[PDB]
């Protein structure tokens, strides 16, 4: 009767004692919306396993005999052989199907949960917010009685057919979605989001075309893209709860998720959030929807009758009987709800404890809900090794013995990579090495700067999870406002010239080798004091503010920083070989046009004849310039043909590609299950079956 009781759904007096709280958190509630969400989540995970979890690509990620540097959270964990991995993914698929159909619900939830987290914890490079959310949702649904309506288990068991469920099943899910929205919103209260730096280039998508009718691009990239996301996060947190604002909240959230689905390649996360939005509605919407259909549909859709009493709820007895004393499962449910929501609130802000994982950002990516807030651009990665026997110094391929590229941003992954290199290099005639790393990275369009100390042997470096790393360079936030001026310098260049901005610590130096192609390269000092050394003649010159030097092309040079503070400078260079090739190609095209339009009546040179003919047959091999011209023309024609493609063909190719992925996954799984069960046949049969599996559907 009270307005507060109507708005929030409970009275204050319900919270006066523990017993009343348990009764409130285990009141009867209709099961329909929970069942619909269970079905949708199961279907989306079933579609997601062969696509993003990597079942199709698993034959080339855990291949036996290959030497790879893994990145598991615990060093004890190691992958199983490939066949057992396919068995694990098969168990995942069966669990997802069981969750979707509601057949043996608890067993199916366990069979989906344990393998999913085994795969999740095995590799830190595949972590991301929408996989963590799927894991959490699978964890929650393991305990919820979501098979009480529209489930096969109901048909096989009368006691669980259209039965009541306790309220906390809905409360935990609503709390999870609210925490996602609110934590994402507050995490976006950052200087790089409110000022237009993160996601600066996404306003050019054609989906934002109508907004440009009333706003300029610079405002459209700030008011709509950035501030709109923050406001929608907070409001969609709050609006969906109350009855007054549910319709507008649903509309805005649906538009937001559809645009996120189209703009990004996040995957099934937009559809999962769309499926989670209706839960804030009344618990009985599927039942009234089923009621509002003709009788013929009602003979196939689920039941419409009122749900029956259950045993997992505390029932208030109005017959004069004493109220049902809460047992154990109700108290356990209430405690689980409270503790789980408290833990979910606390975990995103638990970065002051695990300081070993801290970096320029906070903690490992995946469980902070800071989506599309930081954008990184790497310039150079140099890996040096010194042999422990002869003393030779050598350089490694930067991405050697690795499958991801997130190790350039985390100290722990760097340490694991260093240990892997230490164990693996003795196969390549290298004794106990000392490995040094030199990585340059810029976050949100700042000066490119070192992230790790290049003078520290990472193999023998000290790292522990709960202590700050002493060999991670601080991020210079004092140089942030320069991002204004640098942008102006970016707009003052020609169509050929390019610019790279560098900031360096005192004491350190950068050694560089300008390639012979990059002629007419110059270095200019913006702030601080540096000295540029040419090693060809061993000559070093000290550069003050606003001074420019013309560097040699094809030689080594060094820049040393010799100021109390960090020094910022810039390389401005132009590629001479590409320019000369472009001029020659333009000249050749001009001669071709003169030949075609009737001018240049004189006989063509022999080297030009292949251009008119277009085919090298019965003649000398073409010169490199002719080959480049023909390749460019063919590429341009191919691109032009690709642009002129009707929509239906693109849709058909999309469907065929997806069908190919699904078929390949299924066939490889069947082959390996046969290998596990009946043993491994001869090599020729394996080759034949693998050839059959990879065949395109056509």
């Amino acid at each position: 009767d009270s307005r507060i009781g109507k708005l929030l759904g409970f009275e204050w007096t319900d919270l006066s004692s523990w017993r009343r709280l348990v009764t409130l958190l285990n009141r009867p509630t209709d099961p329909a919306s929970l069942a619909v969400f269970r079905f949708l989540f199961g279907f989306l995970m079933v579609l997601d396993i062969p696509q993003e979890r990597g079942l199709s690509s698993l034959d080339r990620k855990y291949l036996d005999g290959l030497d790879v540097c893994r990145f598991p959270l615990l060093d004890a964990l190691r992958p199983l052989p490939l066949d057992w991995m396919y068995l694990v993914y098969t168990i995942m698929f069966l669990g997802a199907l069981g969750m979707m159909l509601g057949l043996c619900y608890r067993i199916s939830c366990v069979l989906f949960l344990l393998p999913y987290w085994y795969v999740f914890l095995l590799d830190k490079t595949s972590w991301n917010n929408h996989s963590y959310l799927y894991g959490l949702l699978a964890f929650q649904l393991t305990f919820m009685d979501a098979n009480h309506y529209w489930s096969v288990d109901g048909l096989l068991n009368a006691h669980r057919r259209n039965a009541h469920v306790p309220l906390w099943n809905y409360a935990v899910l609503r709390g999870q979605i609210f925490i996602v929205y609110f934590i994402a919103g507050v995490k976006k209260l950052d200087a790089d989001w409110v000022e237009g730096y993160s996601m600066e280039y996404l306003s050019r998508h054609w989906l934002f075309s109508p907004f440009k009718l009333l706003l300029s691009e610079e405002l459209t990239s700030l008011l709509v893209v950035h501030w709109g996301g923050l406001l929608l996060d907070l409001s969609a947190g709050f609006l969906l709860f109350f009855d007054v604002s549910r319709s507008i909240g649903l509309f805005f959230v649906s538009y937001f998720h559809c645009m996120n689905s189209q703009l990004f390649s996040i995957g099934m996360f937009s559809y999962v959030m769309l499926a989670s939005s209706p839960l804030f509605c009344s618990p009985e919407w599927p039942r009234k929807l089923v009621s509002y259909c003709p009788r013929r549909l009602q003979q196939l859709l689920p039941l419409k009758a009122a749900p029956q009493p259950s045993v997992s709820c505390v029932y208030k007895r109005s017959r004069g009987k004493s109220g049902q004393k809460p047992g154990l499962r109700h108290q356990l449910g209430a405690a689980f709800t409270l503790l789980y929501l408290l833990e979910q609130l606390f975990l995103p802000y638990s970065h002051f404890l695990t300081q070993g994982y801290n970096n320029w950002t906070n903690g490992l990516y995946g469980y902070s809900w800071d989506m599309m807030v930081h954008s990184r651009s790497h310039q150079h990665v140099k890996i040096t090794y010194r042999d422990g026997r002869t003393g030779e110094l050598g350089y490694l391929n930067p991405g050697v013995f690795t499958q991801s590229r997130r190790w350039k941003d985390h100290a722990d992954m760097l340490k694991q990579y260093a240990t892997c290199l230490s164990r693996l290099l003795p196969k390549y005639n290298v004794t106990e090495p000392q490995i040094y790393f030199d990585i340059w990275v810029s976050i949100n369009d700042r000066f490119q700067q070192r992230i790790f100390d290049p003078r520290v042997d990472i193999v023998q470096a000290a790292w522990s999870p709960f202590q700050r790393t002493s060999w991670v360079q601080p991020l210079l936030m004092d140089l942030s406002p320069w991002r204004a001026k640098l942008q102006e310098i970016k707009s003052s260049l020609d169509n050929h010239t390019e610019v790279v901005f560098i900031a360096d610590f005192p004491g350190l130096h950068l050694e560089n080798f300008v390639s012979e192609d990059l002629g007419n390269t110059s270095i200019q000092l913006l702030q601080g004091e540096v000295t540029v050394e040419l090693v060809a003649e061993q000559k070093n010159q000290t550069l003050r503010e606003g001074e420019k030097m013309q560097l040699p092309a094809g030689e080594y040079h060094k820049v040393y920083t010799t100021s109390p503070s960090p020094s910022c400078y810039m390389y401005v260079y132009v590629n001479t070989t590409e320019l000369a090739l472009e001029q020659d190609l333009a000249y050749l095209q001009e001669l071709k046009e003169k030949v075609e339009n009737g001018s240049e009546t004189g006989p063509l040179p022999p080297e030009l004849q292949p251009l008119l003919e277009g085919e090298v047959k019965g003649g000398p091999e073409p010169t490199p310039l002719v080959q480049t011209f023909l390749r460019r023309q063919q590429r341009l024609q191919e691109i032009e043909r690709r642009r002129n493609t009707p929509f239906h063909e693109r849709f058909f190719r999309f469907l065929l590609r997806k069908l190919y992925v699904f078929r390949r996954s299924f066939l490889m799984t069947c082959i390996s299950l046969r290998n596990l069960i009946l043993g491994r046949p001869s090599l020729e049969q394996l080759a034949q079956e693998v050839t059959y599996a990879n065949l395109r559907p056509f």
Binding site: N128, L396, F401, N512, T691
Partner: protein
């Protein structure tokens, strides 16, 4: 120079290199990629496990 793992001093020290052929790599997105076949020793391992494909 003893295998694909190692590189020379010159190729290691070129800071001014063309990255693509546009970077701006944001997190989240979708981790999976088709570059896994460029690993060192892939062809031999694949031939041992799945035969002469």
């Amino acid at each position: 120079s003893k295998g694909a793992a190692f590189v020379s001093k010159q190729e290691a020290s070129e800071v001014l290199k063309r990255p693509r052929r546009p970077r701006r790599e944001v997190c989240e997105l979708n981790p999976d990629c088709d570059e896994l076949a460029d690993h060192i020793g892939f062809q031999e391992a694949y031939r041992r496990f799945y035969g002469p494909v």
